[PDB]
Amino acid sequence: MPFSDFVLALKDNPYFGAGFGLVGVGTALAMARKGAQLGLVAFRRHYMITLEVPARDRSYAWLLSWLTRHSTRTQHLSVETSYLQHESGRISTKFEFIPSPGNHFIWYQGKWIRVERNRDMQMVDLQTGTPWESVTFTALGTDRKVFFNILEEARALAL
Amino acid sequence: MPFSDFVLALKDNPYFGAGFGLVGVGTALAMARKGAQLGLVAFRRHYMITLEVPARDRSYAWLLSWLTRHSTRTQHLSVETSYLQHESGRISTKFEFIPSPGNHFIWYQGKWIRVERNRDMQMVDLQTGTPWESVTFTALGTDRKVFFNILEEARALAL
Numbered sequence: 001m002p003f004s005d006f007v008l009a010l011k012d013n014p015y016f017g018a019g020f021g022l023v024g025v026g027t028a029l030a031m032a033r034k035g036a037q038l039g040l041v042a043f044r045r046h047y048m049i050t051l052e053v054p055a056r057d058r059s060y061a062w063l064l065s066w067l068t069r070h071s072t073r074t075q076h077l078s079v080e081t082s083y084l085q086h087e088s089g090r091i092s093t094k095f096e097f098i099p100s101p102g103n104h105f106i107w108y109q110g111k112w113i114r115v116e117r118n119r120d121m122q123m124v125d126l127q128t129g130t131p132w133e134s135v136t137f138t139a140l141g142t143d144r145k146v147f148f149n150i151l152e153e154a155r156a157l158a159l
Numbered sequence: 160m161p162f163s164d165f166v167l168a169l170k171d172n173p174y175f176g177a178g179f180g181l182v183g184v185g186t187a188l189a190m191a192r193k194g195a196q197l198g199l200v201a202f203r204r205h206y207m208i209t210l211e212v213p214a215r216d217r218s219y220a221w222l223l224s225w226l227t228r229h230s231t232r233t234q235h236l237s238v239e240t241s242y243l244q245h246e247s248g249r250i251s252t253k254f255e256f257i258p259s260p261g262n263h264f265i266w267y268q269g270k271w272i273r274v275e276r277n278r279d280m281q282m283v284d285l286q287t288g289t290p291w292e293s294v295t296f297t298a299l300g301t302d303r304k305v306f307f308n309i310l311e312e313a314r315a316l317a318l
Contacts, residue, residue, distance in 0.1 A: 006176070015177035023184060045235065045262065052237040052259050056289065059240045059254070120280060126288035142234055151238065151254055159250060 048138060051147040055125070055133040059151060063135055064098050066154035067106065067115060076100040101133075109146060114138040207297060210306040214284070214292040218310060222294055223257050225313035226265065226274060235259040260292075268305060273297040 010016045053059050068074065080096040104115040116136040125132050137147055169175045212218050227233065239255040263274040275295040284291050296306055 006180070010176060010180045013173050013177045013180070015174060016180045019177060019181040020184065023181070023188075027188075041262075048234065050235045050259055054237075057238060057240045058242045059238055122280060123283045123290070126283055126285070128288075132283075132290065142232070144232075144234070144236070155252060155254075159252070 047140065047142070049141055049144055049147065051137040051151075053135045055130070056127070059154065060133070060135060062154040062158040063151070064117075065096075066150065066157055067099050067104070068097055069157065070108070071099075071104070071106050074099055074104065076102060076104065108150065111139050111141065111146060113146070206299065206301070208300055208303055208306065210296040210310075212294045214289070215286070218313065219292070219294060221313040221317040222310070223276075224255075225309065225316055226258050226263070227256055228316065229267070230258075230263070230265050233258055233263065235261060235263065267309065270298050270300065270305060272305070 053063060068077065076099070078098045078100045080098050082092075082094045082096060084092045086092065099115070099117055101117045101119045104117070106113050106115060114137070116138065117133065118136070119131050119133045121131060123132055124130065137150070139146060212222060227236065235258070237257045237259045239257050241251075241253045241255060243251045245251065258274070258276055260276045260278045263276070265272050265274060273296070275297065276292065277295070278290050278292045280290060282291055283289065296309070298305060
């Protein structure tokens, strides 16, 4: 009766049935969420192109300058000041404007490219003393030539 | 009656029975989840082959270059720039493209190998100043010769 009676009695308990149904619904929802995450990951892997550039690499500044030139009207941006006090008290200053951290959208060729400048606010880079930053380019398609052309243009502009 | 009456009275309480059944169902689900995790661990231990290469080891760069050569059409990738300003103002630049962090799939011999380049965003390596990175190769089977051949090919390509 600890097992035989309880198993059969709970079969006629509306509260127990409702609880079991709710638990099943929650489990199905969790499985659906996991499947949605897996599907998004697969879609990103098989139908998107990405280029991740860390701040350590020198292409970071070149790409940012190319972005700030190509997209003249960027509502969100940051500022980089070049200050140099030469001997004899000669001060040289110049404001270079750079895309701000966050999400930006540009139009290159006939593709909409999503630019992500993220600044991980967790550690500090030991070789620079600045937080770890990176820039990521995301686009729809399976051709990597767009990023190659963008990098080549940025390098040519920098040089 | 604090114990005798309460024990017998709760035996005829539909709400108490439903609650006990729900608690038992939850406990069974937790045991099932733990057993599933244990089974996955055992399956990984007894039917998979893995090779973990930390960023500190020199085989990391060789394996990444071998990957970027073998899989020419990698939609997801990162960039490594070799910049050297020689004396007399001579600037040498070259873009080396490397697989991006995440999951990648390659086809070597007749096996599908899962490549995992993970960048643990928690600490920073003291000897480099970069976050701790590693590459992991996973495949189905019990033969380690595939990874040995891959490492040998990467070393030969590097040298």
